[PDB]
């Protein structure tokens, strides 16, 4: 029986049992590199969250509730594609792109640290979360590397990198590669999404060695058609719930369900946070690489008779119960 009923218990075998053992520990710090979330929401009341704005950015003009209202109205109407961007352009041309970021940062941050009994109950609500907004080229590898270095200095155990910088290969700028290696050398996990390009292009940092790449799964566990895959996405990535994931949006207590690898990544950041929290609770040392390799090696591969291209599932669907066996002997 689940002591902390979570929306993803039925889609994620072993989640409920893991929540019965922990909701996170404050000694585990997650730094989220994304936009600027809304801490006034009740899902963050009592959450140990704080913002650190990179000092080398000039802060952007605040965004009016009205602009957020406009964005959400166009979403609620279910407009999509060209029609959606013509709508956004007509009412909020100068803030549409920042709102996309900030909105997603709300959703992602709540998926991770949302407090129980609020509108959004996240995976790891008792962990310490530092948002590092990039609201103020901003996805350039230089700037992500700089952000990463700071996240380490801030004491990150996990760095959730919400960003996808395009690439047609596994090569990224060396500065970013060095930043990822630096995370491995310091026992810090980096999670990031594989992207929603349907393999028309790939993403940095997902495809760089060292990162935990995350792909998006449907409700039934099969991979979403748009979720990028192949190369290092497959070798070092894992599939997790990505469709219809519940989360927050700014300025309103009403939550919204979103779809994408950006919504699957946070779930894995959360699951990883709990596995690390459990190490602390049991006096074992915190070990990011053990957690990452445990998740990868126990991931369940898709059935070739159900999914046409199994490599789309990357190493496989997240398998908490296997992870628990490897790390804790359960």
């Amino acid at each position: 029986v689940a002591l902390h009923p979570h929306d993803l218990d039925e889609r994620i075998p072993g989640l409920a049992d893991l929540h019965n053992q922990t909701l996170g520990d404050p000694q585990i710090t997650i730094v989220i590199i994304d936009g600027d979330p809304d801490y006034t929401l009740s899902c963050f009341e009592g959450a140990e969250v704080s913002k650190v704005f990179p000092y080398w950015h000039e802060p952007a003009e605040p965004i009016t509730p009205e602009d957020y209202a406009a964005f959400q109205s166009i979403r609620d109407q279910g407009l999509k594609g060209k029609e959606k961007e013509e709508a956004l352009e007509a009412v909020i041309p100068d803030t549409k792109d920042r709102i996309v970021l900030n909105d997603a940062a709300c959703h992602v941050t709540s998926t991770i640290v949302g407090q129980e009994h609020s509108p959004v109950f996240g995976i790891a609500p008792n962990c310490r979360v530092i948002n590092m907004p990039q609201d103020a080229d901003v996805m350039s590898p230089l700037n992500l590397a700089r952000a990463i270095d700071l996240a380490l200095e801030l004491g990150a155990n996990i760095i959730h990198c919400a960003f996808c910088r395009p690439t047609q290969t596994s090569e990224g700028e060396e500065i970013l590669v060095q930043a990822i290696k630096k995370c491995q050398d310091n026992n810090v996990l980096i999670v990031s999404p594989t992207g929603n390009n349907s393999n028309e292009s790939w993403c940095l940092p997902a495809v760089l060695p060292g990162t935990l790449a995350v792909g998006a799964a449907k409700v039934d566990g099969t991979p979403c058609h748009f979720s990028n895959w192949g190369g290092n996405n497959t070798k070092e990535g894992i599939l997790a719930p990505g469709e219809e994931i519940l989360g927050a949006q700014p300025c309103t207590e009403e939550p919204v369900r979103l779809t994408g690898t950006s919504m699957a990544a946070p779930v894995m950041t959360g699951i990883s946070a709990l596995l690390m929290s459990l190490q602390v609770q049991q006096g074992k040392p915190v070990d990011a690489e053990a957690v990452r390799t445990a998740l990868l090696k126990t991931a369940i591969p898709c059935d070739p008779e159900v999914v046409e291209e199994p490599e789309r599932c990357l190493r496989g669907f997240v398998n908490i119960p296997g992870a628990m066996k490897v790390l804790f002997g359960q």
Partner: peptide, 9 residues
């Protein structure tokens, strides 16, 4: 328009 972070469709 790239369908990231949230996919429409």
């Amino acid at each position: 328009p790239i369908p990231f972070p949230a996919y429409d469709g």
